[PDB]
RNA sequence: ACUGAAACUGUAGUAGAACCAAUCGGGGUCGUCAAUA
């Protein structure tokens, strides 16, 4: 699908219909081979599997807390913009 | 005591209307030339 949908993309952005934004969109490692497999196989696909969350697990085997504390500093650098909701 | 999810800044719109690269001009026709001794 992703190979196929990438291939069919011809335009993005503003004034697509008036010749802005003509493009090729290619995934690394998806080719017409991935397209051809779907063409060969799409009739025998089914529904995708149902989504479920990754649940937490607990053993309870931690030792009881004892001093001293350790303070491990973590430096965070933003690489994209980051949205941290104050109010929606 | 626990990151929400998902959502194309897109959609319509002719850098165009107007403006003469033009106005005037017979491919024509006659007197010397030179300055010393």
Output Rg (C-alpha) for chain A, integer angstroms. Answer: 24
> Closest nucleotide to residue A14 (Cα to C1')?
B10
Q: Note whether A24 and A38 are within 8 A (CB).
A: no
Q: Is A11 helix (H, G, I), strand (E, B) or coil?
A: strand
- Protein CA A72 to sugar C1' B8 (Å): 42
Q: Determine the Cα–Cα distance for residues A38 and A32; give it in Å rounded to an integer.
A: 10
A55 touches strand B (CB under 7 A): no
Q: Determine the Cα–Cα distance for residues A68 and A29; give it in Å rounded to an integer.
A: 50
Which residues are CB-neighbours of A72 under 8 A, at least 6 positions away? none
Q: Give the technique used to solve this structure.
A: cryo-EM
How is residue A79 written in tokens? 């690489």
Count other C-beta atoms under 10 Å from residue A34's C-beta: 16
Which positions on chain B have an atom < 7 Å from some protein CB?
2, 4, 8-13
The DSSP line for A25-72 is ---TT--HHHHHHHHHHGGG--PPPPP----------PPPP-SPP---
A19 touches strand B (CB under 7 A): no
């Amino acid at each position: 699908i992703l190979a196929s949908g990438a291939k069919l993309t011809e335009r993005l952005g503003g004034k697509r219909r008036r010749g802005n934004g003509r493009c090729e969109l290619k995934f690394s490692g998806y080719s017409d081979q991935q397209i051809q497999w779907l063409k060969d196989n799409y009739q025998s696909v089914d529904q995708p599997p149902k989504y479920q969350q990754n649940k937490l697990q607990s053993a309870g085997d931690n030792p009881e807390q004892q001093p001293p504390w350790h303070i491990i500093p973590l430096t965070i650098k933003t690489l994209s913009p980051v949205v941290l909701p104050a109010r929606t």
